[PDB]
């Protein structure tokens, strides 16, 4: 069997809370009034939800309504409980209301509206300072949810809403998020392929908050090198290959060895042998204005195979890469 693992930080925050904090099945939802909201237009669709721009007709404010499709209620209750636990935290999307058809019982989450610019258009216009600023806003959200015992597990640009004119960032879609309990074996089928940490790709189930810091590193790399997504595999196996062509295969094998992970024999054929590339190799004239020694040092400390060796969100905020941001706060 593999070697056990426990989070370096916030290990027992849920152990100490009363049962009701993390026991989302027991939670009793307080429902608002469905007739306060009028749907205006469809914004998009998840695999288990559709998202609408809407208007709160009592105050004419814009809101976003996410109608959740007939799925197991346990999944819905977990997202609600997590959103309520984190409400008011820095850069965490605000759940303003929960409503349901009084006759058909179909449930809908009402969120504060963010005037988002789609990242595929926004990112290519961000300056070096913008990237540092928004990375720091995400770290605030992640340190907050991690300190409250919660892993996001789907950190990616699609789940980061940015009202750019107002320098306003919110981390959204807590539908994959989960409470951390030390020693628990979690589903590795989380996050999006390009942002999956190596622990997920090698089926190491005893992961923790540091999963989110890998995803963050992936985002950072795509922003400062202007290469989105940075690690572009065509399936989970190829995804670890793309990581290994950058981080190198030796550190990957050290990781697997350290945790006594039984690596699928298919992997050895396709992983090959790759040196670790210097982060400088990805710098060129089209991204150089976004790259600094600080940026590369910070990136290097997020994108580590060993989840235990990655910066925590709070350590990351201490990094010199953010020196000018912090004075601005
Ligand atoms: C698929 C999709 C469609 C629209 C939006 C969206 C655009 S602006 C905006 N402003 C606040 N929220 C959302 S989504 C609801 C929050 C959540 O699911 O956690 C959006 C986000 C995702
Ligand atoms: Cl953390």
From Swiss-Prot:
EC number(s) per entry = 2.7.11.1
Quote a single Gene Ontology cellular component term.
Answer: Sin3-type complex
Its UniProt entry gives the catalysed reaction(s) as: L-seryl-[protein] + ATP = O-phospho-L-seryl-[protein] + ADP + H(+); L-threonyl-[protein] + ATP = O-phospho-L-threonyl-[protein] + ADP + H(+)
- Boundaries of every Protein kinase domain copy: 37-322
Domain of life, per the record? Eukaryota
Supply the alphabetized keyword list: Apoptosis, ATP-binding, Biological rhythms, Cell cycle, Disease variant, Intellectual disability, Kinase, Nucleotide-binding, Nucleus, Phosphoprotein, Serine/threonine-protein kinase, Transcription, Transcription regulation, Transferase, Wnt signaling pathway
Q: Where in the cell is it found?
A: Nucleus
Modulation of this protein's activity: Constitutively active protein kinase whose activity is not directly affected by phosphorylation. Seems to be regulated by level of expression and localization.
Q: How is it modified after translation?
A: Phosphorylation does not directly affect casein kinase 2 activity, but may contribute to its regulation by forming binding sites for interacting proteins and/or targeting it to different compartments.
Q: Quote the catalytic residue positions.
A: 154 (proton acceptor)
Q: In which tissues is it expressed?
A: Expressed in gastric carcinoma tissue and the expression gradually increases with the progression of the carcinoma (at protein level).
Q: Where do the segments described as Interaction with beta subunit lie?
A: 34-39
Biological process GO terms, please?
A: apoptotic process; chaperone-mediated protein folding; DNA damage response; double-strand break repair; negative regulation of apoptotic signaling pathway; negative regulation of double-strand break repair via homologous recombination; negative regulation of proteasomal ubiquitin-dependent protein catabolic process; negative regulation of signal transduction by p53 class mediator
Binding, ATP: 43-51, 66
Recall the GO molecular function terms of this protein's record. ATP binding; Hsp90 protein binding; identical protein binding; kinase activity; protein serine kinase activity; protein serine/threonine kinase activity
Subunit and partners: Heterotetramer composed of two catalytic subunits (alpha chain and/or alpha' chain) and two regulatory subunits (beta chains). The tetramer can exist as a combination of 2 alpha/2 beta, 2 alpha'/2 beta or 1 alpha/1 alpha'/2 beta subunits. Also part of a CK2-SPT16-SSRP1 complex composed of SSRP1, SUPT16H, CSNK2A1, CSNK2A2 and CSNK2B, which forms following UV irradiation. Interacts with RNPS1. Interacts with SNAI1. Interacts with PML (isoform PML-12). Interacts with CCAR2. Interacts with HIRIP3.
Function, as annotated = Catalytic subunit of a constitutively active serine/threonine-protein kinase complex that phosphorylates a large number of substrates containing acidic residues C-terminal to the phosphorylated serine or threonine. Regulates numerous cellular processes, such as cell cycle progression, apoptosis and transcription, as well as viral infection. May act as a regulatory node which integrates and coordinates numerous signals leading to an appropriate cellular response.
Q: Which family does it belong to?
A: Belongs to the protein kinase superfamily. Ser/Thr protein kinase family. CK2 subfamily.
Related illness: Okur-Chung neurodevelopmental syndrome: An autosomal dominant neurodevelopmental disorder characterized by developmental delay, intellectual disability, behavioral problems, hypotonia, speech problems, microcephaly, pachygyria and variable dysmorphic features.
Q: What else is known?
A: Can use both ATP and GTP as phosphoryl donors. Phosphorylation by casein kinase 2 has been estimated to represent up to one quarter of the eukaryotic phosphoproteome. Casein kinase 2 has been found to be increased at protein level and up-regulated at the level of enzyme activity in the majority of cancers. However, elevated levels of casein kinase 2 are present in certain normal organs such as brain and testes.
What protein name is recorded for this chain?
Casein kinase II subunit alpha
- Protein's organism: Homo sapiens
Q: Which residues of the full protein are shown?
A: 3 to 331 of 391
